Design a protein around this ligand. Structure first.
Ligand SMILES: CNC(=O)[C@@H](NC(=O)[C@@](O)(CCCN(Cc1ccc(-c2ccsc2)cc1)NC(=O)[C@@H](NC(=O)OC)C(C)(C)C)Cc1ccccc1)C(C)(C)C
Lengths: 99, 99
């Protein structure tokens, strides 16, 4: 699909069998979601945003559907103001910027 | 043009007679740049992202040029870790997300 930016590019994603709303963010290297449960072991990661740094839990090879498109990748879980889908997953679904 | 997301979507912008590198961010409500001088009146604003909030100065009706495309809009100036071009300007240059 072609998404304009007059409104926030919020889309429905499916992870762990649950539906959630997330923001397609081209300015994000990684994908970070609000607190949730995920299987397996996690690794620590410190990420930086406009307001500073936060600690997150890193889960790899996690299946996640974005707007119906299937992806399997790294998902970070932590105190984020909103669920954000970063380039690591936007690339998996073939997303690009055009103007 | 079509910008891939394998790498950070960085572009050159012309603003206030200066050339700066900025990140095209579909997940950003506003456009925020590192400390710089801009003409006209302004008002304080607090913006939030990952890590918390930072205080910036809000300048409205500021001429800007991105990848050759001219536009005008609000530009926030403050201690941002990186220059971000938000939706308020991305819309003006006809930028869309496609997949
Ligand atoms: C309502 N707030 C906003 O729209 C704000 N948006 C954001 O912060 C984001 O759009 C992300 C902005 C892009 N930043 C750029 C950046 C790059 C390097 C550093 C940096 C470099 C060294 S120290 C800090 C700091 C910021 N990107 C990010 O924040 C992401 N970080 C990242 O890719 O880092 C490598 C991540 C944390 C989401 C993964 C995420 C977001 C969207 C909606 C609601 C809440 C949050 C605002 C435009 C005001 C700044």
């Amino acid at each position: 699909p072609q998404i304009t930016l007059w409104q926030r590019p919020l889309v429905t994603i499916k992870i762990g069998g649950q539906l959630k709303e997330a923001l397609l963010d081209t300015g994000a290297d990684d994908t970070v979601l609000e607190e949730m449960s995920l299987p397996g072991r996690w690794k620590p990661k410190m990420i930086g945003g406009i307001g500073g740094f936060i600690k997150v839990r890193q889960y790899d090879q996690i299946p996640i559907e974005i707007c119906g498109h299937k992806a399997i990748g790294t998902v970070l879980v932590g105190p984020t103001p909103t669920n954000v889908i970063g380039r690591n997953l936007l690339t998996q679904i073939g997303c690009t910027l055009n103007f």
